[PDB]
Amino acid sequence: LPKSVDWRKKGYVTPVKNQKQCGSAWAFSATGALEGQMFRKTGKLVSLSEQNLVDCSRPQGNQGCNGGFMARAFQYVKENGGLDSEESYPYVAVDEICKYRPENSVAQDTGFTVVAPGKEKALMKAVATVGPISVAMDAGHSSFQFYKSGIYFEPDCSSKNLDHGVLVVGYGFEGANSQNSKYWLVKNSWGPEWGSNGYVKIAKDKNNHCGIATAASYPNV
Amino acid sequence: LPKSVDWRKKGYVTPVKNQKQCGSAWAFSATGALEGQMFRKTGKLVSLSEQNLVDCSRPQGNQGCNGGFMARAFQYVKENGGLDSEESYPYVAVDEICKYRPENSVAQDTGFTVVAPGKEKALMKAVATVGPISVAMDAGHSSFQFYKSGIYFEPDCSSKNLDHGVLVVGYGFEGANSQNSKYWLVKNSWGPEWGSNGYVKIAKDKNNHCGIATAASYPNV
Amino acid sequence: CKKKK
Amino acid sequence: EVCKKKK
Ligand SMILES: [Cl-]
Known about the structure:
Number of helices of chain C: 0
Radius of gyration of chain C: 4 Å
CATH topology of chain A: Cathepsin B, Chain A
Oligomer: heterotetramer
CATH superfamily of chain A: Cysteine proteinases
Distance between the termini of chain A: 23 Å
Largest sheet of chain A: 6 strands, mixed
Structural class of chain A: alpha+beta
Order of helices and strands of chain A: EHHHEEEHEHEEEEE
Distance between the termini of chain C: 12 Å
Number of strands of chain C: 0
Shape of chain A: globular
Number of strands of chain A: 10
Strand content of chain A: 15-25%
Largest sheet of chain C: none
Radius of gyration of chain A: 16 Å
Number of domains of chain A: 1
Helix content of chain A: 10-25%
Number of helices of chain A: 5
Bound molecules: chloride ion
CATH architecture of chain A: Alpha-Beta Complex
């Protein structure tokens, strides 16, 4: 596998978005992964509607701003037959009535694939061959809110208690040697000011730090 | 006009590039604008050759790595009949022999349109109705070199003596009021590591800050 | 598991 | 004013 991967360099990733005061990270993580897969299928990068997911996917088990799951989001897109563009269905960071219109849909999926749980090498292989991957992580620590740069390593991080959904867009390493100071390249949904540019380098191959490889998946397009 | 526009979310914009030690920003700004207009015309996003412009547009008045102007580049593309892809005419950041190949051309323009100088409302109308717009700006400040987050505002910025070419890919605002804390979304050519993933928010409706609306133009395709 | 807010 | 090239 490549020593480094960065799907942003290849056109797979939309700009950093901001969920604001709505517990909708699961929706941003799912649209990030579907955006990468729809791009690989069509050559066209089109931002998808988190608000469509927040307002419409309660039947699949999501709870809007009260939380949800990326896999249930991909299940909604499958059952619904489509998912609207963000341009047509803007984000307002509150729970609202579903306004989905098929004429505005720009994405579809047939289900989703789960990465072998707990296995960072399985996630490295999925990232290298598929594109961006949705993942769950433990973001429940003040060090995460205040993160600015460098490889994030939180001693109290859990790989099982996962309260946040984010997007792995790549992996890399700091310094001349490919095997040390390794990290996952993670797109967050807290705006471009958080993390200096909205991304965080999470320690890689350090025992599934913060659970990045515990519950990783991507839509089937 | 729309309260906000972000052409990156519609597939019009290539990933951030890096001009390195060569004064070729005018070339990156021009290929960025032509990339957006070719996408609007064909639905296909194809990275364009800045090296083609650096090496071949001296007759039109450009000076390669010593500087140039986006309108002279769009004039070159018109007189030349074409512009090669980035893949077929790679970037090497030094002045080289013109190797333009018509068989590798993936873009054309019939000339260019100029935005009324100095008018940010005219630039806003161009950005909203056309796509990404090439603009000149005053980037001669350490505050720009070390920019990372927020709306950029530099007291020493000039609106008339401009040393850099960049691409306005949209505009937006912070907060809930669309009529204040406004910004221009600007793509730079200093690599993704610079700024916010290669981008900067420049203060909008603050008296043509840093000259963004002084010398704006777009190719006609 | 728990919801991913 | 000055005629700066856009480097
Ligand atoms: Cl110009």
